[PDB]
Amino acid sequence: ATATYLKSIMLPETGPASIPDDITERHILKQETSSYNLEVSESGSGVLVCFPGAPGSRIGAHYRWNANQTGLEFDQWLETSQDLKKAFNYGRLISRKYDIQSSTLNGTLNAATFEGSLSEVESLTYNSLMSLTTNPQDKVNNQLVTKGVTVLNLPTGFDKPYVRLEDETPQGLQSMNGAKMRCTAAIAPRRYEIDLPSQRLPPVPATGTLTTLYEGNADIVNSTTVTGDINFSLAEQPADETKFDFQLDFMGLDNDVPVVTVVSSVLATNDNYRGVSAKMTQSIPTENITKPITRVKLSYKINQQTAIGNVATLGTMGPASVSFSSGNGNVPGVLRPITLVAYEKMTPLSILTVAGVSNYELIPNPELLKNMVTRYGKYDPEGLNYAKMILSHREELDIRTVWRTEEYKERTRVFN
Amino acid sequence: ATATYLKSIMLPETGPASIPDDITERHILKQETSSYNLEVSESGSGVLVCFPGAPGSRIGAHYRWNANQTGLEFDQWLETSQDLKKAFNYGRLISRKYDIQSSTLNGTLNAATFEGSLSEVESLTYNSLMSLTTNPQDKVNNQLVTKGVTVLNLPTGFDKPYVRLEDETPQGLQSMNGAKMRCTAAIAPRRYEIDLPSQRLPPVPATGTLTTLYEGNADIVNSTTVTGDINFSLAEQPADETKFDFQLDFMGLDNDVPVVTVVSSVLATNDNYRGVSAKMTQSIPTENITKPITRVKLSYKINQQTAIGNVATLGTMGPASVSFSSGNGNVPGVLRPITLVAYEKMTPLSILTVAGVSNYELIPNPELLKNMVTRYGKYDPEGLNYAKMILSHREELDIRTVWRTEEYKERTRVFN
Amino acid sequence: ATATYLKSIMLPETGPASIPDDITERHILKQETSSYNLEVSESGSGVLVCFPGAPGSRIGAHYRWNANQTGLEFDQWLETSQDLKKAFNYGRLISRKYDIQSSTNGTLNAATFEGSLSEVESLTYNSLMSLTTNPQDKVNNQLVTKGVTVLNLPTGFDKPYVRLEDETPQGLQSMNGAKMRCTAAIAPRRYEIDLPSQRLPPVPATGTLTTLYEGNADIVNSTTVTGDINFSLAEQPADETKFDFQLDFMGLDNDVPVVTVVSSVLATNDNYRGVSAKMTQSIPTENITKPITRVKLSYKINQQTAIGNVATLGTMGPASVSFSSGNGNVPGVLRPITLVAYEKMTPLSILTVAGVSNYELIPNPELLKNMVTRYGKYDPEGLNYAKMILSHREELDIRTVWRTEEYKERTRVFN
Amino acid sequence: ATATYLKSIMLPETGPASIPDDITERHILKQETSSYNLEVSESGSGVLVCFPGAPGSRIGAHYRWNANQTGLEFDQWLETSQDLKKAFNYGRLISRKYDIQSSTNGTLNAATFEGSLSEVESLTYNSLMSLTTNPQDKVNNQLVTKGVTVLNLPTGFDKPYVRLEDETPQGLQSMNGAKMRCTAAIAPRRYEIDLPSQRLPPVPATGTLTTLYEGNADIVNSTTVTGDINFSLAEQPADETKFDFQLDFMGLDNDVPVVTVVSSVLATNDNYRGVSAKMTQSIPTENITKPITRVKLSYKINQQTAIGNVATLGTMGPASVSFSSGNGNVPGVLRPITLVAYEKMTPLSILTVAGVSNYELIPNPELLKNMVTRYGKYDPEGLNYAKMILSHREELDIRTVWRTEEYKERTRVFN
Numbered sequence A, B: 001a002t003a004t005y006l007k008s009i010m011l012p013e014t015g016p017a018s019i020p021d022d023i024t025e026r027h028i029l030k031q032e033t034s035s036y037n038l039e040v041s042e043s044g045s046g047v048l049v050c051f052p053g054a055p056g057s058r059i060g061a062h063y064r065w066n067a068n069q070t071g072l073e074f075d076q077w078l079e080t081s082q083d084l085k086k087a088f089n090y091g092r093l094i095s096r097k098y099d100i101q102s103s104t105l106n107g108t109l110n111a112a113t114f115e116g117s118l119s120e121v122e123s124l125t126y127n128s129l130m131s132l133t134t135n136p137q138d139k140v141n142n143q144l145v146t147k148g149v150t151v152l153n154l155p156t157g158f159d160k161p162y163v164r165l166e167d168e169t170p171q172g173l174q175s176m177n178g179a180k181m182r183c184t185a186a187i188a189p190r191r192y193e194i195d196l197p198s199q200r201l202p203p204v205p206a207t208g209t210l211t212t213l214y215e216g217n218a219d220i221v222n223s224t225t226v227t228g229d230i231n232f233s234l235a236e237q238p239a240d241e242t243k244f245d246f247q248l249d250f251m252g253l254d255n256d257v258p259v260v261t262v263v264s265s266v267l268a269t270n271d272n273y274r275g276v277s278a279k280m281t282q283s284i285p286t287e288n289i290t291k292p293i294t295r296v297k298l299s300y301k302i303n304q305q306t307a308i309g310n311v312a313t314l315g316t317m318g319p320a321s322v323s324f325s326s327g328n329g330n331v332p333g334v335l336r337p338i339t340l341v342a343y344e345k346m347t348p349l350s351i352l353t354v355a356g357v358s359n360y361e362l363i364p365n366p367e368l369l370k371n372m373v374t375r376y377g378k379y380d381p382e383g384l385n386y387a388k389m390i391l392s393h394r395e396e397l398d399i400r401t402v403w404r405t406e407e408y409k410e411r412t413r414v415f416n
Numbered sequence C, D: 001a002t003a004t005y006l007k008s009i010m011l012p013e014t015g016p017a018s019i020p021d022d023i024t025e026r027h028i029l030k031q032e033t034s035s036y037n038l039e040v041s042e043s044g045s046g047v048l049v050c051f052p053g054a055p056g057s058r059i060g061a062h063y064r065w066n067a068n069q070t071g072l073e074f075d076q077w078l079e080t081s082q083d084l085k086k087a088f089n090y091g092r093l094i095s096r097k098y099d100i101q102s103s104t105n106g107t108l109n110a111a112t113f114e115g116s117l118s119e120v121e122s123l124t125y126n127s128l129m130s131l132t133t134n135p136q137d138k139v140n141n142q143l144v145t146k147g148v149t150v151l152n153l154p155t156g157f158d159k160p161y162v163r164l165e166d167e168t169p170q171g172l173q174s175m176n177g178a179k180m181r182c183t184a185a186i187a188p189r190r191y192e193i194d195l196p197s198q199r200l201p202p203v204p205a206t207g208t209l210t211t212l213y214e215g216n217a218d219i220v221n222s223t224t225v226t227g228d229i230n231f232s233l234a235e236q237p238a239d240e241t242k243f244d245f246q247l248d249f250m251g252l253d254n255d256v257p258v259v260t261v262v263s264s265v266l267a268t269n270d271n272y273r274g275v276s277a278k279m280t281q282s283i284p285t286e287n288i289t290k291p292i293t294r295v296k297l298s299y300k301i302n303q304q305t306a307i308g309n310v311a312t313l314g315t316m317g318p319a320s321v322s323f324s325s326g327n328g329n330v331p332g333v334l335r336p337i338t339l340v341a342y343e344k345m346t347p348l349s350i351l352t353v354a355g356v357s358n359y360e361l362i363p364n365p366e367l368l369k370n371m372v373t374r375y376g377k378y379d380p381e382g383l384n385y386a387k388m389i390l391s392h393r394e395e396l397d398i399r400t401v402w403r404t405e406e407y408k409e410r411t412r413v414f415n
């Protein structure tokens, strides 16, 4: 009775099995069903972004192509029917599976499992998905939308820690209306940093106009903390006290429209013009991340004509650098890897149906603890080895992260 | 010779055994004895808080009920005879056991192992402990103080990392008197965040009076780092430059008296009234946490009459949010889980004796390294599996985190 | 030859097998076929409510979403082709199975809830998935073309022969339309409404209904109401006023009473210290025209000279009205239910539901003249076998809710 | 692996084991701990009443002797730490055990009576010993220091899931304090009071209560009263008189009504040939503030011009009032009980009672969202094993009442 773990990995519909590794905490086993009926735009094109390894209850994201095939338009997150953070404080993901097809009655599907973050993808062309990976069993090309594509999560490492889901804490009554405190994702964060040279800021074209300093790719998906010190010195005493504003912009795949903006400003006086420091210290909560963030933009703007010719050098107070750290970022599964499923040439106004199944190991919140029993995992000495071995000969056999649905169906019942 | 690990888990008095998992670093094995003779107040009531899984040398906390059964009065930390951080830089906890009884020759004991943090407990009533968990072998009710209760730590997961104890670093002589730098708990932090709505601050009743914005539950037990940006904008140019003060208060279970307070203030000038930002950046050392912290309180106060009617909106500069991250917080054992032992109807002025035993895997500090040999753990291939299996059938058998002392005594010598 | 019982449980289409438990009465075995071609509204949405364990001949109920997705509109009961109570007086349910698909674009959500219909929080297509955690008790986003199969997994054995509600022999001198029936009586479900020993909320106006209690409750067959809503007025009534107490029984939809019942008293000088309005009605089944899921107790008065007259409730004994329905707590009758929601179906299309039920029945005295009754086949290991498969129900994949194409294949293992 | 059930029966501290009988519904297993530190009165005497088989969360009741040994004074119910009806709708009791001793001089008598609390003739410390003859159902003069253990030996298997009395979802327009609950309904216990078809005893005076019947009866949860106390007067009432009928429910002690309920009629010229006072009340459970062990039906009138007016009873049909309590006849609920009397204890000392109960429960729809339900473990020989040990219960020494020090040792034979 060891094939239990692998069965859950391969046939998530089956239900949960405790993970037979070294992280044996007392827990609960729960299955989660996600149902999504998506509408296709005039273009009949779109991209489906899965986070097959994500412990959270945000497991995907749907994008559409505008009729002109010019860019993408974010539709919605793909979440779980149930908001897990209302009932549990901690969780690991045991196994997951997306079933993608059309529930109408024309159209095809490209699917590939990219072994990096969403922002690390060069292109999202329907055709360019096929070069996100070379592993034959990590992609599927031109599968009829009728027949369907199945997305299976093959463990991206074992012995992964219980992540803290982002539950809300007990409050006092004298609290602001709408204010709440939560115990957020903290463990093993992903940290990006923006490094500005010890030289002069590019000059503003005009007053009150934003001049960009850095733009680049980066992945934020939950609560983030920004720490930094963009410092500088002006060459001359400011004729008039001018206001330097520094904007950090977080945009998604689409439309350059900030998902979240944050600002820090200093006044350049006679008193400090030798070492002005604009300090970044913001903590961006998760409810603010209304769509996947894939790029950052650091810009600045000033306040006075008597400042535009005043050369500001950057290195003065210590390195000019702004960093941000997101919880759980580097936990395998959270941002990496992803599975892209692109659909094209679908009949407009039709429905692309996505059915999800997720199996977790969870730790009930103190309220549920009153009635719910917690148990150490079933005793499974060979369970993990068996999985290590099948994933080992994953290429000889044909174990896939991306399947042609009709195949996943048949070649699967070998695990019962 | 594999039962060695389990023997240490079940009979900590026996002594230490290296943990037979994947984290085989060169180490030392040491046993620690903690002796505590506590005095009972007039009320004959009190609560004992154990952190059975804690790697530190703070393993408990004693609270008393005031004669009126109104609230609790913090007594003291339960620590180890020896301050480990003076001799070692790194440690994991192998196994631990508290022995609680009366050393006088009337009274009972309730005990339950809660699978969350101290602040996540709804009530600390003697009777309400029994609904902190449903697992029969995680609680014990109405045990005579004479007979005693035994608290055993059942591993809350294996493969846990060597935490950094908080040692003091070599200094230079030209240093302040009393100033020191330490290498603190850093790994896998627990991070709480306070999310203020993008709306207006509640109005102060008067000048120099503190108006609360948020109060709630949160657990800090060692060094913490606060990062945030409580920003806002006033509706009108301030008639007079007013001083906004923001107080972050950390209180314990009792008496609302701040364990540690921290403040950040800005001046609202004509220059900045469109985007005032009060920045949180403090680093609260551990020696400042004089008692268990279980709740936070964010309040603000102003400076001028000409400001009380000046509506300050919050969303202006980016989300109004303050977060704090404590090292080791999410390392299993550090804050979760806890074991509560409540005593009531004890003869006042009597002594409740608590004897502790802890077994560690430690890494000697460079001074002790000169003379102390470090070794890889004994070779124990089946050691961990054996433990996984007993904890597996933990309910069939009767392996407990909370025992009736007389039972733990007998049913234990089966492990020699 | 023991797998007979389990075969019937898993493949009801097969036919009936006597239940191999301790309730061996002389009986008959009969299979029942139910055929339903339902029409979909403009909204292409709807909810299908099954009572997989019900001994009666009412085995389901169909609801539709109004084009606005605002609320539900009751369509009809799902009954058996044959009215069993015309031929039999007693019955247990051996096994049952619903086959749901389209006989013409659209999906299906299905979950087996382990409580009564009224105990369901929400009937959203998406909210069905959180009615149970048991993986094999739900199925999400199944194409209406492929179909969903609803299997009844025994909710306990040794369940008693319930009395179907047959009509009794009459005399000729009886009213036209009046009849007496031997109704469901055994192991009833009993709800009670408990009013505090304080004052009734004041009527806004004369002849206007002011509600006292509204809440959820499940009635599905004959009910008996017993109660004593008593009170006392603070002052002698200026004029003799008429207190009316309405007990309303509504369904999932539209607040329109399925059955209303009233009791009224006159507050005189004679009794104002202890007025008692007594509930005593017996609501027959033919009156339950659709599933009842909530109750509403309200009252109204008669005089202006009474609106300021504070009526306190505790006076005569607790102010409480209770009602008891026969068979209510027999497992299968009200609990558990299986919900199947359909959405995004082409309007004016047909959602076909085919049902199969196997009973153990006791023929009515007329059929007894010609029909032989027998003790069940001797099946010593029959019940244990079933207990064991349901035991490892999760290891294996035995379901109350199937993807039809799977139920088809994975089933022929039981022949 | 069959001894699982019996282990739970004998060592309830161990934890729950699904009951291996024919009532296999999908369920949950939960253990419940009850802790009670009782204070002894000046008399050092008292009686402990256990309901070892009760599915509810009311598992006992403590009485004290007044310093004069004249009568008893009710102290409190013995309940479970946790109110089960807030989390579960249905339950059976798997096994239970009380541990009774002093946590500080004194002795204990204990006997398991195989009937209801009201059916006990006397509660003398010494008279407990003649409540049963079965040697292993009683224990005499056990030191309070050493302690007495009360074990529940199954009083029958195949017992049905009783409905715990949960509160139902409400509407907001409801009275403040009013709620409706799904109460105990199954297999009720029904007492009836039968008044002869003769004349009511005459009132000594106006407005004075004259008793008609007093007797023993056991109510412990929600009750429904149905009746028709009818009569006819010999002469047209000189003045319209008000007949009041009081039904009183008292406990073991002090004659002070736990719950009173009244019904009254006016005797007019119009009806004096057949006056009927109708009983219709539904007494909720929150009203049963202490164990009820006796009923008292009395009546009082209103006029001098009525005291000589002979009222005969048989007129309208039998003069009879009945009441039916849910679950009453479910074994364990009212029968059997275990009495533990303590005497000669040091006043102001504490008699500590520790309880353990193991249930099979069905989570309420809210808990269903997250809690898995399972059919019981497959245990073919489990029940037989228990039937057999209880069979040779006398040869061996399996007890409902133990000397604690013995129960401790002779128990670990079941691990």
Ligand SMILES: [Cl-]
Residues within 6 Å of the ligand: A186, A187, A188, A189, B186, B187, B188, B189
């Ligand atoms: Cl970390």
Ligand SMILES: [Cl-]
Residues within 6 Å of the ligand: C186, C187, C188, D186, D187, D188
């Ligand atoms: Cl019944």
Ligand SMILES: [Co+2]
Residues within 6 Å of the ligand: A021, A022, B021, B022
């Ligand atoms: Co390992």
Ligand SMILES: [Co+2]
Residues within 6 Å of the ligand: C021, C022, D021, D022
């Ligand atoms: Co049987």
